[PDB]
C-alpha cells in the first residue's frame, strides 16, 4: 500500500544503512544527504542527478551491487568512502523514483547501464520533471533528517 | 581567604561599633545605582533576641532576618560565643544582583544562645518609622557606606527601599 | 594584523603552472604561485620537523600529526591560518599569452582522411608540423610571445625537459570519416598554444614574499616557537628547495636577495640567518653555513619546546614513508654557469647517464641506487640489492621488502608513480656573480639504515662530475 | 529537450553575456556527466559545437574508457576557458541600477556612501555556491537575475563588521551594527561588477598534495579547475544611514579591511582588492 | 531564468505567471468593485483576455517557441493577441503557464542565499552557524488593494498621503540590503 | 484523567536536575516553547525526525538517557543545544513508556544498537496518529513547566 | 589474544582483589585522562548481587551493569564459576571512546550461579554517599591503576564520574 | 569658545604633569557614568611614544591612537608644539557617545614632528598587565574624575573598559 | 637617499612654484606607463586649500586627498613648515599598487598652519571642468614626466581617467 515520503525514507535510508558495511562510508553518505538537496534545489533536479550518477563512479560492480540492493538485502555497496556514498544516494533517488512509479525499474538500470537509454533517461526526466520536483524534496528532507540522527560526524 | 561583615538592620542603634571594617578596600557588595541596595543579605530561618539584637537561632522557616553584608571582619574580639561561616558563595543569597560573586566569602553573625529559659515568640517587625531610616541612613550608610550623598541626588530614592526591602522577626521579649 | 617579514627572493629557471601546466595562459601570465609557496613551506616544515626529532629522539612522526601540529601557524579545517602569504613581481599587469594568426591551411589538406599524427618541433628558430605519416610544413605564426634562441636550446639540449615536452607537442588525428577544416583548425591551435606556452620559461624571475600574522592567534600555548620554528623552516625551503616543478633537478631555485623584518621579537635569528646568505664567498664557506643552520635547529641554546606534547603519532614503517634532511651529505661545488649545469644533471641521474656509468659503474647496481634514491623509475636480479634482510654489499635495504612477495613498502618502490627524488639539486647564488650548486640526498623512512658516507662518496663523485 | 542540451556550448559562445550563466553552466554539466553518451554518435552532427572535436583526436586506443576520461578533463578545461574569454563583463545595466537605487535611497532620506573597489588578485567569492560546482567543485557567488557575480551584502558587512570589533572592542560593533536586541545603523547592499578590463572570469587550478595525508606513500596530486574573478574588475556596492555617527567608522574602514582579502583564500593572496573610489551624500 | 534558443533577442530572465495567480488578481478586482463602487476593468479586460487562454502556456511580449525554465522545465509555448498590451509596462516578456508546471517553476525561481557565522578566534565557522535564506528575485511584482471606509480622514489619507507613498521597506533582513520595494498604484499608472 | 500533568511534572523533575549548566537548561525551555507548536502544525512524525537530528544520539547522550530513566543523578553532558533537544526526546520517550504506547522492554534495546533503532522509528510510525493526538495536554504542560520555572535567558 | 578482565563497581566490600596480578603488563584500555573514566565496558542483561558482588545472567535486557575492564586474569583460582570468551573487541558497548581497540580479547566475567532456587526478582539501585565511590576508589583504583593520586591531580572530576557514571541492577536475595 | 585637551593613553607615563587644571572648566565631555568611557576619540593615522609620548602622524591610514577631551590648557608653557584645531564636534571620531556636545570644539593634541633621521616601524599594542591599567588609572582616572572613589563603586564596569576598550600604536623605536 | 615630491591634485593654481628638483632621478613612484596613472598616494585626515593651497591637519577620517609620489625636494624655501618623514616602504596605501617601493622614502608633503583662527567645515570637491583638467596635465604630467606626449598619445584616456581617480576634501576658507 502507498507510503508517504517519511516512510519511503525510512525504508530507503534503512535498505541503505546496511549495505554501507565502512563506517567512513555513511559518513560520507550523511555529509552527502547534508547538502545534495540544497544543490538539488539551486541547479535543478536532473543537473544533480546526472552529478550523483557520475560521482557515484559506476562502470565497475559498484552497478550490479547497487541493483542487486533494490531485492537482495544482504548486498554490499563496494568502492571508495566517496564512491559508495554518491552510490547510496543515487539508490535514495532511484528508490523514490521507481516506489512512486515516476519511472520504471527496468528503464532506470538500463539507462544506468547503457550508453544508449542515457540519452532518452535525459529526455524522459525532462518530460516528467514537474512530477518529480514538486515533492522529492520532502523525501530527501527526510532522508537528511534519517541521516544526522543515525550517524555522527568524523 | 575573603572576609565579609554582615549586620542586622534592627529598630535600634546596636550596630554602630562592634565591627571594625568600613570599606577596606575598592569593592562593596551592596551598590546603590539609582535602582536600589542590591544583593541584599535575608538569612533566613533565625530570629532576634530584641535587647541591642543579637540574631537567635530557630528552626522556624517563617522567621528571617534582613541586614547588609559588606567586606568587613569583626575585628576578631567578638565570636568569643557567636557564629561565622565559609561557603562557596553558591549557598548564599541575594537581592537584586549587581556585584561579582566571589566564590568564597566568610561571614560573621550576630548570635545569642537558643535561650533555653523560656521561649522565644518572633512576632513579625517590620521596618516602618521613617525616622528609624533616617537615624540608620547616618548610623550606617555614611560610614561604612562610602558613597551616600556624593554623587547621590538620590537620596530618598532608595531611602524608601528599606520598608520595602528589610523586614524580620524579632522576639519582643 | 601586521607585516612579519618581507624576502626579495629570486627563483632561478622556475618552471610554474596552472590548469594547464605552462607559466602563462590565454588570460594571465603567473610565473609564482602563493598557493606553491604555502605548501612547499608546509613540506618543508614537516621535513625539518621530522629531522629534528629524530635528532633528538630517534623518532618520526606522520604529516598529518606535525601539521595538526602547526594548526595554529599554519592553519587547517579547524582554524584559519595565521600567516598570510603575499607575491609581487614585476610585470603584474595584463600579461596574457595571444595567439594573433597561425597559418595551417595547409596541414589541414595535409590531413584529409587520414588517422595520423601530428608532431611539432622547434627547428631553428622556424617550427615545422612534422606528420609523422611523411610530411613536414614550416608552419608561420605570429605572437607577443617572443622565445629567444637560448630558450629553445635550453629545452633542446636538456634531456628532462625535452622529456616533459612528449606531451606538449603531438596530437593523433583521426579525420577517416571525415572532417571540416574549421575544426582541425582549433584542434591544430590548441595544439600549437600548449607547445607555444611550454617556452615561457623566463630566467631571473625575481618576487617579494610579504608575511602577514594574525596577531590574534597571540602566544596561547606554544605559538611563539611554534612560528619561530615556522620561520626556520621557510629559510630551509628557501635555501634547499625552490618553487615550480622540477625542483629536484635544479629549476626553480630559490636566492636570497633581502630580508627586511618588522618585528624582531620573532624574526631577530632568522633575519641573521637569512643575510648570512647575501654574499657567500666560496664552497666550502656556504658548506659551512648550511651546517650551521642545520644544527641551530637540533644543538643551539634553543632547539625545542613544544614536541613534549602528544598530539603526534610514530609512523608504521610497514605503511608510512617520511624525509628528513640528514645534515652530513651536502656536498657543494662552484658552477660558474647554469644552463650547462642543468643539462648535465639529467647525467647524473639517468640510468645509462655517462656522469653515473662512470660512479658505479654497473648493472642491476646503478638501478638499485636509482629505484631507492632518485624518485620513481619506470621498471621493466635488482630487488637482491633491496632487501630488508639479504646480503648487503651495497647498503640500499628498504625496510619492509621481502623476496618474492610483495609488501607495501614493495609497492611502492616499484609501483607508485608519484615519489619525490630523495637525490635532489639545488642552484643558488648571492648578488655577486658566482654560483654554487647544492646537491644532496634526504633521508627517507623506508631505508632500514643505510652506510652513510658510501653514499656521500657516490654524492660527491656526482656533484664533481655533473659539472 | 536533449537539443537545447547538445546546442548549448554554441550558445554560450555565440550569446556570449547575454546568456543565463548559471542554467547555462547548469545544462552545460549534464553534457559534462554524460560525456561518453554525448559523443556516442550524439554530437547533433553539427560543426560548430565543442563536442567532435573530441572525436577527431585520439588520446589512448589501449582503453575506450581512458579515451573517455581524458576527453572529459580535457572538456572541462576547455569550458572553463569558454565561460572564461566568452562571458564578458557588459556593466551599463549594473551602473543603471546603483544610480537609480541611489536616487531611490535620495528620496528616502538616507546618506549613502558608493563605495568602488577593484580586484587585484584571482578573487574567490561564494567558493561553496552552486555555480560550475556541478563541473568544477567549486563555485562563484553568482546572481542568476542579473547574471553576474556578486560579493553578498552580508559578506562585506561581516567583514567590516569584524574589523571593527577588533579596532573598537565588541561594543562600539554592537553599538553600530546592533545586536539581538537593537537593529543595526548601517545597510549594506550587495556588490556587482561595474568595468573589467578583458576577461571577468578565470580559469584556475588548486592541486593538493598532501592535504590529509599520512605519509609519502599515500600522497598524489588531485588538479582542481575552477573559475575565479579575473583581476582588475571593478565592484561597486552602497552604503545608507540614516544617523551621522556611523559615517565615522565605516569611512576609515573601508580602504583599511579591503586590502586583507574580501572573499576565499585570502591567506594565500587571492581575494585581494583595491579600494579605487570613495563618496558620500549627506541628506540633511 | 531562461535557456531559449530560436529566438531573435536572447534573454537572461523572464516574467513568469499562472492562470490561478491572475484568477486571484480578478477575483480581488471584481470583490472590490463590489463593495466599493469603483471599477477597474481596464486590468479586468487585460486579464480576462489572458485567462481565455488557460489551459496552455503562453507568451505575451515575445515569440518564444519553447524554453527551459530553471534548468530544469522545458515548456512550449503558444503567443497572445498581441492586443494584449504590457501589464507589466516594460521591454521583458511575460510566460503564463499552466498551474500544474508554474508552480514548479515559480517555487524553483528563488534565490536560497547561504550565510554562515564566523568564529571570530579560530576565523572559521561556528558550529551550527550555517543556514540558508529564500529571497525573491528583483522586480518580482506582487499585487494588493487598499481599502477604506468612509471617512473625512479617509478622505485625506487617499488624497495625499496615498499620492507621495511610492517607496518602502518590506519584510527583514534591510541591513543587508533587502526588502526595498516601489508602489504603483493601478489608479495612478495601470 | 489528568494524571498527564503528574507525568510532565516527574518528567520535567528528571530533565531539570540532569540538566545541570543553566544553559542546557535555558535551551530546554526554548526547545519547549517550540516542538509542541511544530508538532501541532507539521505532525508528529517530520517533528520527531527533526528532534532526533539534532539530539544526535551517538552512543553516549543514548546511555546517559537510558541512565536518566532509572538513576535520578544521571547527567546529560554535551553542546547546550545538543542537550536540549535530547531531553526533549528523553521527554517523549518517558511520555511513550509511562502510557504504555510502547514497552520500555523495546525501548531499551533499541537505544543501544542502531540496528533496532529504526525498528523504535517504524514503531513510532505506525502509531503517530496516537501519539499526535495523546501527547498534545503532556506536552503543553512541559511548556507551562518550563516557562514557569526555568529563568528566560 | 591479549586478556582483558572484567570487574564493576559494587557497594558490598566484594571489591578489593579480584585478579592477583594488578596489570601484568603495561597496557589498558579504561583510561583516565583528567576526562572521567573512559571507554566504561557496559554489559545489559546481567544483574549483580554485591554479596559475593558478581553479575547474574539475565534475560532481561533493562538490567545493565557497567564495570571496568582491566587487563587481568582470574588469577586461576575463580575458574569454574567463570565463562570464557574470546571477541573482536568491537562487540563490546564501550563508553567515550577515544581511540582504537586491540580487536582481539579474552575476558572472564564475575559470574554467580543462574539462582534457579528463586525468581531473580530484580532490583535498580544507584549510587550516592561519596564516601562510598571514596573507598573504592581505594579498594581497587590504586592497586589497579597507579595513575590515582599520582599522576591525577583533579580527581575530584573522577569523583563525580564515578558517582554519576555508575548505576545497575541487584536482586535482594 | 570652549577648551579641551587630548590625553593620549598608551601603557606608559607621560602624563603625571603636563596639565594644568584639573577639572579645567566646565566639563569632561569624556564622561564616567558607570557605563565606563563614552566620548573616547580616536585619532586615525597618527601614533604615540613608549617615552617622550606624543603624537606623531604616521601617514599610514592603518594606524591609530585613542584619548580623551578634557577640559583645559596644559601648563601655558607648551601648545607652540601641540596642535590647536577648532573643530565643529561633527568631525570627531568619537566612540561610544552617550550625550552631546557644545557643537564647536578646541582641541589641542600633544603633537611632534614625526622622525627625520630613521623610519617609523609602528607596533600595534594592547593595553592589558592589570598594574599598568591600575596605575594608570591612578594617573589619569583618578586623578582627571574626582567623582572616582567617592560614589563610582562599578569601577569594576570601567576596569574591562580599560582593558579592552583602549589601544593604540607605538614607534618601538 | 630617494626623497619625495607628494603633489597633490587639486582644482585651482598652486602648482606653478613649489620645487626646485623636480627632476629626481630614474624611477618616479607615480607612473603613466600605457596603462593609466599607477602607484598614486592616498592620504586620510588632511584636507587641502586652494589659497596658499597645502594641507591642513584635520581629524575627520573622512577627509582625504589623493595625488602623485614623484623623486624631489620642498623648493629648499620650504621643509621649515613641510612634512618631511621617513616610512618602511608599506606603511604607505598606494591606490592602482604596480610594483614594490624601495623598502624606506622621503615624502615632503605640504603641511600649512592649522588654522587656529577659523573653524574646520570641510568640504568634499572632485575634478571635473575639462579645462582645469588639461591645464594641470600641461603642468604637472607634461613637466615631471619626459613620457606625455613624448611617449605616449592615447592619454586622452588618462584625461577622462584624472577626472574621477582624483579627488579630495577641501574648506574653501
Known amino acids: 500500500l502507498y507510503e508517504e515520503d ?51 563512479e559506476l562502470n565497475s560492480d559498484s552497478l550490479d551491487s547497487l541493483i542487486s540492493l533494490f531485492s537482495s538485502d544482504n548486498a554490499i555497496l563496494r568502492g571508495s568512502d566517496e564512491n559508495v556514498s554518491y552510490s547510496a544516494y543515487l539508490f535514495i533517488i532511484l ?12 528503464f532506470l538500470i538500463q539507462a544506468l547501464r547503457c550508453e544508449k537509454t542515457r540519452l532518452d533517461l535525459i529526455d524522459k526526466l525532462y518530460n516528467l520533471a514537474p512530477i518529480i520536483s514538486a515533492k522529492i524534496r520532502t523525501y530527501l528532507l527526510a ?11 568524523r | 581567604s575573603t572576609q565579609r561583615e554582615y549586620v542586622f538592620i534592627p529598630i535600634t542603634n546596636s550596630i554602630t561599633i562592634d565591627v571594625k571594617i568600613t570599606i577596606g578596600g575598592s569593592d562593596h557588595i551592596t551598590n546603590i545605582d539609582e535602582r536600589g541596595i542590591h544583593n541584599v543579605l535575608v538569612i533566613t530561618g533565625y530570629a532576634v533576641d530584641e535587647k541591642n539584637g543579637r540574631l537567635v537561632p530557630t528552626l522556624d522557616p517563617c522567621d528571617y532576618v534582613k541586614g547588609i553584608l559588606v567586606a568587613g571582619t569583626p575585628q576578631q574580639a567578638q565570636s568569643n560565643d557567636f557564629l561565622t561561616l565559609k561557603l562557596p558563595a553558591n549557598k548564599l543569597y541575594l537581592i537584586r544582583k549587581k556585584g561579582n560573586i566571589s566564590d568564597d566569602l566568610k561571614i560573621y553573625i550576630p548570635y545569642s544562645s537558643p535561650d533555653a529559659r523560656n521561649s522565644m515568640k518572633t512576632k513579625p517587625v517590620s521596618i516602618s518609622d521613617d525616622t528609624i531610616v533616617n537615624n540608620i541612613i547616618k548610623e550606617v550608610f555614611d560610614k561604612i557606606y562610602n558613597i551616600t550623598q556624593k554623587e547621590k541626588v538620590k537620596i530618598e530614592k532608595v531611602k524608601e527601599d528599606i520598608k520595602e526591602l528589610f523586614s524580620y522577626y524579632a522576639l519582643e521579649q | 594584523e601586521e607585516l612579519l617579514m618581507s624576502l626579495k627572493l629570486k627563483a632561478l629557471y622556475p618552471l610554474t603552472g596552472g590548469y594547464n601546466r605552462h607559466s602563462i595562459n590565454p588570460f594571465y601570465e603567473e610565473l609564482v604561485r602563493p598557493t606553491e609557496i604555502k605548501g612547499l613551506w608546509r613540506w618543508w616544515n614537516r621535513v625539518l620537523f621530522n629531522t629534528l626529532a629524530y635528532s633528538t629522539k630517534g623518532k618520526l612522526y606522520t604529516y598529518e600529526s606535525i601539521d595538526r601540529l602547526f594548526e595554529d601557524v ?10 598570510r602569504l603575499e607575491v609581487i613581481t614585476d610585470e603584474g599587469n595584463d600579461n596574457r599569452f595571444e595567439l594573433s594568426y597561425v597559418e595551417l591551411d595547409k596541414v589541414i589538406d595535409c590531413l584529409r582522411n587520414y588517422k595520423r599524427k601530428v608532431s611539432l618541433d622547434f627547428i631553428d628558430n622556424t617550427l615545422i608540423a612534422e606528420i609523422e605519416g611523411s610530411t613536414k610544413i614550416p608552419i608561420s605564426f605570429k605572437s607577443n610571445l617572443d622565445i629567444d634562441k637560448i630558450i629553445k636550446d635550453l629545452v633542446h639540449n636538456n634531456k628532462l625537459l625535452s622529456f616533459e615536452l612528449l606531451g606538449f607537442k603531438s596530437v593523433e588525428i583521426d579525420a577517416t570519416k571525415i572532417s571540416d577544416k574549421k575544426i582541425l583548425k582549433e584542434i591544430l591551435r590548441d595544439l600549437i598554444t600548449n607547445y607555444l ?21 597571540e602566544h596561547k600555548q606554544n605559538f611563539e616557537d611554534k612560528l619561530k620554528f615556522a620561520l626556520y623552516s621557510l629559510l630551509v625551503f628557501i635555501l634547499l628547495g625552490g618553487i615550480g616543478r622540477k625542483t629536484s633537478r635544479g629549476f626553480g631555485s630559490l636566492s636570497i636577495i633581502d630580508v627586511k623584518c618588522y618585528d624582531n621579537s620573532i624574526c631577530k635569528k632568522i633575519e641573521d640567518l637569512a643575510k648570512n646568505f647575501l654574499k657567500i664567498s666560496s664552497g666550502n664557506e656556504l658548506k659551512s653555513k648550511i651546517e650551521s643552520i642545520l644544527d641551530c635547529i637540533k644543538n643551539s641554546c634553543i632547539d625545542t619546546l613544544y614536541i613534549e606534547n602528544n598530539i603526534l603519532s610514530e609512523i608504521d614503517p610497514k605503511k608510512n614513508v617520511v624525509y628528513f634532511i640528514n645534515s652530513d651529505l651536502f656536498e657543494v661545488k662552484r658552477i660558474n654557469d647554469k644552463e650547462k649545469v642543468l643539462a648535465n644533471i639529467y647525467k647524473a641521474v639517468s640510468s645509462e647517464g655517462c656522469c653515473i656509468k662512470s660512479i658505479i659503474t654497473d648493472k642491476y647496481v646503478r638501478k638499485s641506487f636509482l629505484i631507492a634514491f632518485g624518485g620513481y623509475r619506470k621498471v621493466e636480479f635488482i630487488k637482491n640489492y633491496l632487501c630488508e634482510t639479504c646480503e648487503t654489499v651495497s647498503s640500499f635495504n628498504i625496510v619492509d621488502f621481502l623476496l618474492s612477495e610483495g609488501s607495501f613498502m614493495s609497492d611502492y618502490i616499484l609501483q607508485y608513480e608519484h615519489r619525490n627524488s630523495l637525490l635532489r639539486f639545488k642552484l643558488i647564488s648571492d648578488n655577486s656573480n658566482n654560483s654554487y650548486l647544492i646537491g644532496y640526498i634526504l633521508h627517507s623512512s623506508y631505508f632500514k639504515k643505510i652506510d652513510i658516507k658510501y653514499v656521500r662518496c657516490i654524492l660527491e663523485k656526482l656533484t664533481y662530475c655533473v659539472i | 529537450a536533449i537539443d537545447f542540451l547538445v546546442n548549448i556550448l554554441e550558445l554560450i559562445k555565440e550569446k556570449q553575456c547575454n546568456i543565463n550563466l548559471f542554467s547555462a553552466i547548469s545544462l552545460t554539466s549534464i553534457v559534462y556527466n554524460n560525456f561518453g553518451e554525448f559523443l556516442s554518435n550524439n554530437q547533433s552532427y553539427s560543426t560548430n559545437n565543442p563536442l567532435l572535436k573530441y572525436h577527431i583526436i585520439i588520446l589512448n586506443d589501449k582503453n575506450k574508457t581512458k579515451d573517455v576520461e581524458e576527453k572529459r578533463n580535457i572538456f572541462k578545461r576547455e569550458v572553463a576557458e569558454l565561460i572564461s574569454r566568452n562571458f564578458k563583463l557588459d556593466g551599463e545595466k549594473v551602473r543603471n541600477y546603483f544610480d537609480s537605487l541611489k536616487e531611490v535611497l535620495k528620496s528616502l532620506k538616507y546618506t549613502i556612501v558608493d563605495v568602488e573597489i577593484t580586484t587585484r588578485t584571482r578573487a574567490l567569492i561564494g567558493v561553496s555556491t552552486s555555480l560550475g560546482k556541478l563541473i568544477f567543485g567549486s563555485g562563484i557567488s553568482f546572481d542568476p537575475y542579473m547574471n553576474l557575480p556578486y560579493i553578498p551584502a552580508s559578506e562585506i558587512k561581516g567583514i567590516v563588521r569584524s574589523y571593527i570589533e577588533g579596532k573598537l572592542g565588541e561594543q562600539e560593533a554592537e553599538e553600530i551594527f546592533g545586536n539581538e536586541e537593537r537593529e543595526g545603523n548601517v545597510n549594506f547592499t550587495d556588490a556587482y561588477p561595474t568595468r573589467s578590463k578583458d576577461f571577468l572570469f578565470v580559469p584556475d587550478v588548486i592541486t593538493p598534495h598532501y592535504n590529509g595525508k599520512k605519509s609519502e606513500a599515500d600522497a598524489e596530486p588531485r588538479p582542481v579547475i575552477h573559475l575565479t574573478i579575473a583581476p582588475k574588475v571593478t565592484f561597486r556596492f552602497l552604503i545608507y544611514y540614516k544617523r551621522e555617527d556611523v559615517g565615522k567608522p565605516i569611512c576609515d574602514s573601508m580602504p583599511i579591511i579591503l586590502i586583507r582579502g574580501l572573499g576565499a583564500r585570502s591567506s594565500v593572496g587571492y581575494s585581494l582588492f583595491e579600494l579605487r573610489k570613495i563618496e558620500v551624500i549627506k541628506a540633511a | 531564468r531562461i535557456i531559449e534558443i530560436d529566438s531573435a533577442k536572447p534573454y537572461v530572465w523572464v516574467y513568469v505567471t499562472t492562470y490561478e495567480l491572475l484568477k486571484k488578481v480578478k477575483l480581488y478586482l471584481d470583490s472590490i468593485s463590489q463593495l466599493s463602487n469603483a471599477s477597474f476593468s481596464n486590468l479586468k479586460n487585460k486579464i480576462d483576455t489572458i485567462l481565455a487562454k488557460e489551459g496552455k502556456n503562453i507568451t505575451l511580449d515575445s515569440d518564444l517557441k519553447s524554453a527551459i525554465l530553471n534548468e530544469d522545465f522545458y515548456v512550449e509555448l503558444e503567443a497572445l493577441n498581441n492586443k494584449i498590451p504590457s501589464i507589466i509596462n516594460a521591454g521583458v516578456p511575460l510566460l503564463v503557464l499552466e498551474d500544474s508546471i508554474g508552480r514548479e517553476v515559480i517555487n524553483r525561481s528563488l534565490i536560497r542565499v547561504r550565510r554562515i557565522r564566523i568564529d571570530r578566534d579560530k576565523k572559521v565557522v561556528e558550529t551550527g552557524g550555517l543556514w540558508s535564506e529564500e529571497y525573491v528575485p528583483m522586480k518580482t511584482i506582487f499585487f494588493s488593494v487598499l481599502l477604506g471606509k468612509e471617512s473625512k480622514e479617509s ?16 519584510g527583514g533582513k534591510e541591513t543587508i540590503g533587502k526588502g526595498i520595494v516601489e508602489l504603483r498604484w493601478v489608479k495612478d499608472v495601470i
Request: include cysteine.
Open chain 1, 143 to 153: 532522508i537528511k533528517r534519517l541521516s544526522e540522527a543515525l550517524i555522527e560526524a
Open chain 3, 197 to 217: 606556452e611550454y617556452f615561457n620559461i623566463k630566467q631571473e624571475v625575481t618576487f617579494t614574499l610579504n608575511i602577514y600574522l594574525d596577531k590574534s592567534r
Open chain 5, 155 to 170: 478622505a485625506i489619507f487617499a488624497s495625499c498621503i496615498l499620492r507621495n507613498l511610492r517607496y518602502v521597506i518590506l
Open chain 1, 95 to 106: 528508490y523514490y523514483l521507481i516506489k512512486r512509479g515516476i519511472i520504471e525499474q527496468k
Open chain 1, 6 to 56: 517519511y516512510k519511503l525514507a525510512l525504508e530507503a535510508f534503512k535498505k541503505v544503512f546496511n549495505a554501507l558495511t565502512h563506517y567512513g562510508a555513511k559518513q560520507a553518505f550523511r555529509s552527502r544527504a547534508r547538502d545534495l538537496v540544497e544543490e538539488i534545489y539551486n541547479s535543478g533536479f536532473i543537473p544533480t542527478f546526472f552529478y550523483i550518477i557520475s560521482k557515484a
Open chain 3, 74 to 83: 599554519f592553519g587547517s579545517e579547524n582554524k584559519k591560518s595565521a600567516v
